[PDB]
């Protein structure tokens, strides 16, 4: 009944051999196996991992179900999407190493059988999977709702999650209206403080100036369509560097050295010899740029002005968020930055040329943020499993609360970030009446209730407070056009933004 850490993958390899759909994920785990085992040993030396209860865990991979018709397993080796498979691989491995009893499902049959068996304590699932869960179990699916952790790469903002509020705003997202606690949404990057950051591990095989060809650039973009209207950009880079590619070819200049779609180990070799990894603008927020940076590549990161969102970009229409991307990879831009990441206006030929010349003259510094290491991911998911409880113990602890007042036109996300903090939506409940507001030296001469994502709000001219009337509408996202927002912030560990200092 207590969890014991695992240091041998033999049982995991047995579980993943049982579906062809797991093949790509099994090969990833195999490539990274020695790093994983080193990391769970290192974590166990730093932190008491004793006295943890072994959980029975459902892992339901909706994206790999026949019944989903997503056909992601089908394209895993031929240039199809991999970012979700990377995250599922790393989650399953983390759960396994931490000693939990994992029940892996990629079918309605397995889903039914596991949930039939009872004693499930935690459920990892995607939004496509959650639709299947609800249909399969019937009305008692809600009995398990507080155990769900929903892998949702791009994030779900509260205004899309609240079914009635979303309807009232005319949000037609096919992904939203689940009415969960939004911290139950697990994201690919820490872009949505209403949600939890799950992430993944960045694959790299280094243990360097002679290995790396100073002259060699590699284009990020494994599909021909991605290269449309990039020729001035690529011509500037080609003035100074060889331009290589991994494309599965009418958009691709004649001078480009195409290697085709590479296996994991061959791609990693290509990164380790590359000076510059070249963003074209798409895809958004993938793992590949972090893999490049972990291998000592600089990343040329197209700047978006205006920032891209469901308001101006087809890709984002129907996604359950209004979040705006300031670049192809905002995490790389904001949490890494120069010299590893150069965020440039692709239409500023002088800025592009200056960036390429700078990168040519840079010293090579392989870099991985701690939160994207094996040990960083184990520490984060262990903390979530042990401390995150939506089933009713307050975590993060109230000690971590720092209250900030967002100016008009400023969100709670923005005001926390501007103080090197992060919005903590679990603390909004402590900011939502006259008495609580005195504590933080805001004085409500009058007040009212509103069901609005933009409250609690303060008019400092009229000394008027609007408080939240629907607790499911508490939202880090959103700026009040007229009033100040009363914003719950917390500290974060540098390199581990998911955790406060007193959260371990
Ligand atoms: C796996 C998952 O749900 N990932 C996140 C999701 O991302 C979207 C998702 O779409 C999955 C596939 O769903 C259907 O099977 C199709 O619509 C696929 O499109 C394919 O065919 C199109 C032609 O009809 C073509 O335009 C396109 O090139 C593609 O080959 C979808 O791929 O997964 C993909 C893969 O990363 C992603 O690009 C999609 O945005 O978004 C959810 C909401 O934000 C998120 O919760 C989830 O994690
Ligand atoms: O055929 C396709 C494929 C993708 N896309 C789009 O690209 C998006 C992100 O691609 P992907 O998830 O595979 O991540 P990427 O950064 O390329 O890294 C993978 O691929 C890398 C190898 O290139 C690998 O090293 C890394 O670990 C992986 F995560 C995906 O959500 C699709 O919208 C597409 O439209 N058509």
Swiss-Prot record:
Entry's Gene Ontology cellular component terms: extracellular exosome; Golgi apparatus; Golgi membrane; membrane
Induction: Induced by IFNG treatment in monocytes (in vitro).
UniProt catalytic activity: N(4)-{beta-D-GlcNAc-(1->2)-[beta-D-GlcNAc-(1->4)]-alpha-D-Man-(1->3)-[beta-D-GlcNAc-(1->2)-alpha-D-Man-(1->6)]-beta-D-Man-(1->4)-beta-D-GlcNAc-(1->4)-beta-D-GlcNAc}-L-asparaginyl-[protein] + UDP-N-acetyl-alpha-D-glucosamine = N(4)-{beta-D-GlcNAc-(1->2)-[beta-D-GlcNAc-(1->4)]-alpha-D-Man-(1->3)-[beta-D-GlcNAc-(1->2)-[beta-D-GlcNAc-(1->6)]-alpha-D-Man-(1->6)]-beta-D-Man-(1->4)-beta-D-GlcNAc-(1->4)-beta-D-GlcNAc}-L-asparaginyl-[protein] + UDP + H(+)
Residues the record marks as carrying a glycan: 207, 215
Membrane protein topology class: Single-pass type II membrane protein
Annotated binding of UDP-N-acetyl-alpha-D-glucosamine, by residue: 291
Temperature dependence: Optimum temperature is 50 degrees Celsius.
Keyword Transferase tagged: yes
pH dependence: Optimum pH is 6.5.
Post-translational modification: N-glycosylated.
Annotated compartments: Golgi apparatus membrane
Effect listed in the UniProt record for changing residue 291 to A: Loss of catalytic activity
Molecular function per GO: alpha-1,6-mannosylglycoprotein 6-beta-N-acetylglucosaminyltransferase activity; manganese ion binding; protein phosphatase inhibitor activity
EC number per UniProt: 2.4.1.155
The organism's place on the tree of life at top rank: Eukaryota
Disulfide bonds, paired cysteine numbers: 146-391, 412-487, 416-489, 423-476, 444-465, 500-503
Residues annotated for substrate binding in this entry: 152-153, 319
Pathway: Protein modification; protein glycosylation
Region called Sufficient for catalytic activity, residue ranges: 1-504
The protein's role, per its UniProt record: Catalyzes the addition of N-acetylglucosamine (GlcNAc) in beta 1-6 linkage to the alpha-linked mannose of biantennary N-linked oligosaccharides. Catalyzes an important step in the biosynthesis of branched, complex-type N-glycans, such as those found on EGFR, TGFR (TGF-beta receptor) and CDH2. Via its role in the biosynthesis of complex N-glycans, plays an important role in the activation of cellular signaling pathways, reorganization of the actin cytoskeleton, cell-cell adhesion and cell migration.
Protein name (database record): Alpha-1,6-mannosylglycoprotein 6-beta-N-acetylglucosaminyltransferase A
Provenance organism: Homo sapiens (Human)
Part of the full-length chain shown: 214 to 741 of 741
């Amino acid at each position: 009944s207590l969890a014991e850490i695992r240091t041998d993958f033999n049982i995991l390899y047995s579980m993943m051999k049982k579906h062809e759909e797991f093949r790509w994920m099994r090969l990833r785990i195999r490539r990274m196996a020695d790093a994983w085992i080193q990391a769970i040993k290192s974590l166990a030396e730093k932190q008491n991992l004793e006295k943890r209860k072994r959980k029975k865990v459902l892992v339901h991979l909706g994206l790999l179900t026949k019944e989903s018709g997503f056909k992601i397993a089908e394209t895993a080796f031929s240039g199809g999407p991999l970012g979700e498979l990377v995250q599922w691989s790393d989650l399953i491995t983390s759960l396994y190493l931490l000693g939990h009893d994992i029940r892996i499902s990629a079918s309605l049959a397995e889903l039914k059988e596991i949930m039939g068996g009872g004693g499930v304590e935690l459920i990892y699932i995607d939004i496509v999977g959650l639709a299947q869960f609800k249909k399969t179990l019937g009305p008692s699916w809600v009995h398990y709702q507080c155990m769900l952790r929903v892998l949702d790469s791009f994030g779900t903002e509260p205004e899309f999650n609240h079914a009635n509020y979303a309807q009232s705003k005319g949000h037609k997202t096919p992904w939203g209206k689940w009415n969960l606690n939004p911290q139950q949404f697990y994201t690919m990057f820490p872009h949505t403080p209403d949600n939890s950051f799950l992430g993944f591990v960045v694959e790299q095989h280094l243990n360097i100036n002679e290995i790396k060809r100073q002259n060699q650039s590699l284009v990020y973009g494994k599909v021909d369509s991605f290269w449309k209207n990039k020729k001035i950009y690529l011509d500037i880079i080609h003035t100074y560097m060889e331009v290589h590619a991994t494309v599965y070819t009418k958009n691709i200049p004649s001078y480009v050295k195409n290697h085709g779609i590479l296996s994991g180990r061959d791609l990693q070799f290509l990164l380790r010899e590359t000076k510059l990894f070249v963003g074209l603008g798409f895809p958004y927020e993938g793992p590949a740029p972090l893999e490049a940076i972990a291998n000592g590549c600089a990343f040329l990161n197209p700047k978006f002005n205006p920032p891209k969102s469901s308001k101006n970009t087809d890709f984002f229409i129907g996604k359950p968020t209004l979040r705006e991307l300031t670049s192809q990879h905002p995490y790389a831009e904001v949490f890494i930055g120069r010299p590893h990441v150069w965020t440039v206006d692709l239409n500023n030929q002088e800025e592009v040329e200056d960036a390429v010349k700078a990168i040519l003259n840079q010293k090579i510094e392989p870099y991985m943020p701690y939160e994207f290491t094996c040990e960083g991911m184990l520490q984060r998911i262990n903390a979530f499993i042990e401390k995150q409880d939506f089933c009713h113990v307050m975590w993060p602890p109230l000690s971590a609360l720092q209250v900030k007042l967002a100016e008009p036109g400023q969100s709670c996300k923005q005001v926390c970030q501007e103080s090197q903090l992060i919005c903590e939506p679990s603390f909004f409940q402590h900011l939502n009446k006259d008495k609580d507001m005195l504590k933080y030296k805001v004085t409500c001469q009058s007040s009212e209730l509103a069901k609005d994502i933009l409250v609690p709000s303060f008019d400092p001219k009229n000394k008027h407070c609007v408080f939240q009337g629907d607790l499911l509408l508490f939202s880090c996202a959103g700026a009040h056009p007229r009033h100040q927002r009363v914003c719950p912030c917390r500290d974060f560990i540098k390199g581990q933004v998911a955790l406060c200092k007193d959260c371990l």
